[PDB]
Write an enzyme that holds these catalytic residues in place. Sequence first.
Site, PDB file in Angstrom:
ATOM      1  CG  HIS A  41      -0.511   0.182   2.501  1.00 16.05           C
ATOM      2  ND1 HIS A  41      -0.467  -0.843   3.421  1.00 16.05           N
ATOM      3  CD2 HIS A  41      -0.058   1.284   3.143  1.00 16.05           C
ATOM      4  CE1 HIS A  41       0.022  -0.388   4.561  1.00 16.05           C
ATOM      5  NE2 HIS A  41       0.279   0.901   4.419  1.00 16.05           N
ATOM      6  N   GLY A 143       3.109   6.285   9.979  1.00 17.83           N
ATOM      7  CA  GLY A 143       4.500   6.086   9.565  1.00 17.83           C
ATOM      8  C   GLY A 143       5.138   4.801  10.063  1.00 17.83           C
ATOM      9  CB  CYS A 145       2.974   0.927   7.413  1.00 19.39           C
ATOM     10  SG  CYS A 145       1.297   1.145   8.010  1.00 19.39           S
TER      11      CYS A 145
HETATM   12  C1  LIG Z   1       0.762   2.642   7.759  1.00 14.54           C
HETATM   13  O1  LIG Z   1       0.302   2.421   6.240  1.00 14.54           O
HETATM   14  C2  LIG Z   1       1.576   3.941   7.752  1.00 14.54           C
HETATM   15  O2  LIG Z   1       2.302   4.076   8.722  1.00 14.54           O
HETATM   16  N1  LIG Z   1       1.451   4.891   6.701  1.00 14.54           N
HETATM   17  C3  LIG Z   1       2.176   6.206   6.590  1.00 14.54           C
HETATM   18  C4  LIG Z   1       2.502   6.526   5.105  1.00 14.54           C
HETATM   19  C5  LIG Z   1       1.357   7.396   7.225  1.00 14.54           C
HETATM   20  C6  LIG Z   1      -0.550   2.883   8.625  1.00 14.54           C
HETATM   21  C7  LIG Z   1      -0.294   2.604  10.158  1.00 14.54           C
HETATM   22  C8  LIG Z   1      -1.476   3.018  11.048  1.00 14.54           C
HETATM   23  C9  LIG Z   1      -1.654   4.537  11.257  1.00 14.54           C
HETATM   24  C10 LIG Z   1      -2.160   4.756  12.659  1.00 14.54           C
HETATM   25  N2  LIG Z   1      -1.774   3.479  13.361  1.00 14.54           N
HETATM   26  C11 LIG Z   1      -1.391   2.504  12.447  1.00 14.54           C
HETATM   27  O3  LIG Z   1      -1.010   1.296  12.621  1.00 14.54           O
HETATM   28  N3  LIG Z   1      -1.626   2.068   8.037  1.00 14.54           N
HETATM   29  C12 LIG Z   1      -2.729   2.571   7.355  1.00 14.54           C
HETATM   30  O4  LIG Z   1      -2.894   3.786   7.252  1.00 14.54           O
HETATM   31  C13 LIG Z   1      -3.864   1.667   6.701  1.00 14.54           C
HETATM   32  C14 LIG Z   1      -3.695   1.794   5.123  1.00 14.54           C
HETATM   33  C15 LIG Z   1      -3.867   0.479   4.269  1.00 14.54           C
HETATM   34  C16 LIG Z   1      -4.650   0.769   2.962  1.00 14.54           C
HETATM   35  C17 LIG Z   1      -4.488  -0.722   5.042  1.00 14.54           C
HETATM   36  N4  LIG Z   1      -5.185   2.067   7.159  1.00 14.54           N
HETATM   37  C18 LIG Z   1      -5.542   2.057   8.543  1.00 14.54           C
HETATM   38  O5  LIG Z   1      -4.733   1.684   9.385  1.00 14.54           O
HETATM   39  C19 LIG Z   1      -6.998   2.536   9.063  1.00 14.54           C
HETATM   40  C20 LIG Z   1      -6.855   3.638  10.201  1.00 14.54           C
HETATM   41  C21 LIG Z   1      -8.024   4.681  10.256  1.00 14.54           C
HETATM   42  C22 LIG Z   1      -8.818   4.882  11.436  1.00 14.54           C
HETATM   43  C23 LIG Z   1      -9.890   5.836  11.484  1.00 14.54           C
HETATM   44  C24 LIG Z   1     -10.178   6.605  10.322  1.00 14.54           C
HETATM   45  F1  LIG Z   1     -11.185   7.512  10.342  1.00 14.54           F
HETATM   46  C25 LIG Z   1      -9.422   6.438   9.133  1.00 14.54           C
HETATM   47  C26 LIG Z   1      -8.359   5.485   9.114  1.00 14.54           C
HETATM   48  N5  LIG Z   1      -7.847   1.385   9.546  1.00 14.54           N
HETATM   49  C27 LIG Z   1      -8.726   0.706   8.681  1.00 14.54           C
HETATM   50  O6  LIG Z   1      -9.037   1.186   7.589  1.00 14.54           O
HETATM   51  O7  LIG Z   1      -9.295  -0.529   9.007  1.00 14.54           O
HETATM   52  C28 LIG Z   1     -10.548  -0.975   8.388  1.00 14.54           C
HETATM   53  C29 LIG Z   1     -11.847  -0.090   8.723  1.00 14.54           C
HETATM   54  C30 LIG Z   1     -12.253   0.976   7.859  1.00 14.54           C
HETATM   55  C31 LIG Z   1     -13.412   1.759   8.143  1.00 14.54           C
HETATM   56  C32 LIG Z   1     -14.188   1.494   9.302  1.00 14.54           C
HETATM   57  C33 LIG Z   1     -13.801   0.442  10.167  1.00 14.54           C
HETATM   58  C34 LIG Z   1     -12.644  -0.333   9.873  1.00 14.54           C
END
Ligand SMILES: *[C@](O)(C(=O)NC(C)C)[C@H](C[C@@H]1CCNC1=O)NC(=O)[C@H](CC(C)C)NC(=O)[C@H](Cc1ccc(F)cc1)NC(=O)OCc1ccccc1
Lengths: 305, 305
Positions: A41, A143, A145
Site C-alpha cells: 500500500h 509512519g 507501517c
Molecule cells: C501505515 O500504512 C503507515 O504508517 N502509513 C504512513 C505513510 C502514514 C498505517 C499505520 C497506522 C496509522 C495509525 N496506526 C497505524 O497502525 N496504516 C494505514 O494507514 C492503513 C492503510 C492500508 C490501505 C491498510 N489504514 C488504517 O490503518 C486505518 C486507520 C483509520 C482509522 C480511522 C479513520 F477515520 C481512518 C483510518 N484502519 C482501517 O481502515 O481498518 C478498516 C476499517 C475501515 C473503516 C471502518 C472500520 C474499519
Amino acid sequence: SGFRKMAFPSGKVEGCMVQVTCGTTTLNGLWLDDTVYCPRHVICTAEDMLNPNYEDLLIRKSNHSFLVQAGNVQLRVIGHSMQNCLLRLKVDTSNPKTPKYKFVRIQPGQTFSVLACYNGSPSGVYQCAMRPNHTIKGSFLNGSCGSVGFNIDYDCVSFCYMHHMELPTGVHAGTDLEGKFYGPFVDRQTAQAAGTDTTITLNVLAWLYAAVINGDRWFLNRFTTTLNDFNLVAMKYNYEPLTQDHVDILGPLSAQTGIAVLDMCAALKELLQNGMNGRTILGSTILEDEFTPFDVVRQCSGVTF
Amino acid sequence: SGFRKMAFPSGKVEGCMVQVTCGTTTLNGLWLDDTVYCPRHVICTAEDMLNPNYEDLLIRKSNHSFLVQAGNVQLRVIGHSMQNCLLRLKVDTSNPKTPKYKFVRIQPGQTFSVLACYNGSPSGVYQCAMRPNHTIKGSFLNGSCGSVGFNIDYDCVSFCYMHHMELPTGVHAGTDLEGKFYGPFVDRQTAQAAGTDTTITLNVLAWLYAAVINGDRWFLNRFTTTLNDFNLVAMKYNYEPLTQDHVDILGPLSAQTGIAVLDMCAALKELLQNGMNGRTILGSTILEDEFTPFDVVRQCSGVTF
Ligand SMILES: *[C@](O)(C(=O)NC(C)C)[C@H](C[C@@H]1CCNC1=O)NC(=O)[C@H](CC(C)C)NC(=O)[C@H](Cc1ccc(F)cc1)NC(=O)OCc1ccccc1
Ligand SMILES: *[C@](O)(C(=O)NC(C)C)[C@H](C[C@@H]1CCNC1=O)NC(=O)[C@H](CC(C)C)NC(=O)[C@H](Cc1ccc(F)cc1)NC(=O)OCc1ccccc1
C-alpha cells in the site's frame, strides 16, 4: 530473580530497516541481501485507499517510482514484484549487515518482539503476543507501517510480522514476510473489525509456573481437576479450552516445580472463581497471558527457589 | 494508537558488551574505546565476599589476571585501575563499534532500558524505572552483573546503570558508570535492605495524560484541588508529594490536552479514594508509575484524539 516482559535484543534487525517512498507516501522497509520488503500500500494515494486494485496500480509504476534510503544512502531499485500484500524491491546493493535469518508464520498465542520504526529509523522495541483473534496490541503511529516483528534463536532472526494497519478498537494487524495477512483482514480501508478475543490459557498457566519458580506458591491448592471440568470453567470466563497438547507442552515446567499440570489447572480455576483477593503474582494484580512456556524457560532460573 | 512499555533499540549497546573473567568468576563488561568497565567484585572469591578489601585484593592482581573476550576474540589488558565500585581495564584494541556516548547519573523516577547479558552475550531488553528507594525491579539471574542501563538521544547513548546485586526483596541495585552506587548500598554481602518505596506521582499523572491523548477521558471530573490538599491525599496513599516543579514539567502535556495539571490531580485524588471500579486505563487495572512525562511525549501522538 524478577520477571519482566522482555524483548529480544534488536541490533540484528536495526541494520535491516530502510525507508521506502512512492509519490507522497513514505513507510519502512526491510532490507535483506539485495531485496527490500515493504507493505504494498506504499503505492496507494489517499483517493484510492477504499478499494485499490494493486495489480493495476503496480503495472503503472517503474523502478524509479520507488525511492529507497538506507540511512543517508540511496539504494537504486533495479526490479520489483508483488508477493501477496508485500512488494519485493530488488536493489543494486546487497545489505552488508544482513543477519542469518528466516521467515516464519507464527501461531496464535505465540510472542515476538516488535521494532517500532519511523522513516526507516528505529524508535523502540517491545514484546507482543499474537492474539487468538489474529491481532496484536501494539503501539503504532502514522509512519509505522513496514515495522517488523521477530524472534531470535542463537544468531538466527526469525521474522514473523510486518505492520500494515490499525483497526477501530485500537488494535493492530499485519502480515508475515510472505505478505499473507494474519487473520481475515485485507489491506483496504473498507469496514473491518477484529473478531471477539479470548484469553490464552496455556500462557496463563506458564506464567503461574514462573511465579512458583520465582518462589511464590500462595495460589496453589490441594485440589485437582479433569480437563473437561476445567474447560467448563474456561468457557465461562472466556479462556481458550485446554487440550492434551497444551498439557504435554507444560511437562518440563511441571517437572521442574513438582506441580502436576492439572493441579495447576485447579489453582487457576480457583483464581478465576474467587479472584486474587487483593494479592499479586509476579507483580501483577491480574492473570497475565502474554508469556509462553518457552518465554518462561528462557527468562526464569533453571532451579526453583 | 496504543501504549506500551517500550525499550530503546539496543544495537549500539550490544556491540559494546564483553565478558570479563578473573579466577573462577565471570561477568559482563562494557567496552568503549580502549577501556572495559566492569563490577569490581569480579576479583572476589566466595570466601571473601562478606567483607572484601578491594584495594588489598586488586594490588595482588596483574594485567594477565583478567581475561577479556569480545565474541570469540581475546582482548589483552595492558593496564587496570579501580574507580569507586568499578574496574577500568585498558585493552590493546579500541572497540570499532563504540557509539557516541556519555555517562549520566539518572535521578529517582527516571526510566531507562536494560540490556540483560550473560557471558558477554545479550539475552533481552526491557524498560525499568529508578525507584524512589534507589532500586530497580529488574529481571537478573546469576551472571547478569555488568549488564548496563541506558537511554538514547539521536545517536548518543547515555549509559546510566551497571548491575551489581540483588537484595532480599528480589529487587536490584547497581552503580552509574563512574562506579558510584545508586542508594546507600555497598558491594559486600553484609545485611542490607531497600528503604520503603513510594509511588512516583509525576509519572502517574504523565500516564493519565497519555490516556487522554489516546482518546480516553472517563476518569476526569469537574473538580480541582490545591497542591496542599492533593499532598494530604498523596501522603495517605504513599505517593510522592507533588511540587511546583512537577506541575511545571507537566505544562506541555497539559497544553496539548487542555486539562489543567491541578484538575488532573483532582482526577487522580478521586481514583485513589474510589478505586477504578473494574475499569481500565491504557489496558491497566492499576495506576502505572513507570512512564515519565518524557516517555509519554516520545511514544504518544502529537495530536489528541
Ligand atoms: C501505515 O500504512 C503507515 O504508517 N502509513 C504512513 C505513510 C502514514 C498505517 C499505520 C497506522 C496509522 C495509525 N496506526 C497505524 O497502525 N496504516 C494505514 O494507514 C492503513 C492503510 C492500508 C490501505 C491498510 N489504514 C488504517 O490503518 C486505518 C486507520 C483509520 C482509522 C480511522 C479513520 F477515520 C481512518 C483510518 N484502519 C482501517 O481502515 O481498518 C478498516 C476499517 C475501515 C473503516 C471502518 C472500520 C474499519
Ligand atoms: C553478579 O555479581 C553476577 O552475576 N555474578 C556471577 C559471577 C555469578 C550477581 C547478580 C545477582 C545474582 C542473582 N541476581 C542478581 O542480580 N551479584 C552478586 O552475586 C552480589 C555480589 C557482590 C559482592 C555484591 N551479591 C548478591 O547479589 C546477594 C544475593 C544473595 C541472596 C541470598 C543469599 F542467601 C545469598 C546471596 N545479595 C546481597 O548480598 O545483598 C545484601 C544482603 C546480605 C545478607 C542478608 C541480606 C542482604
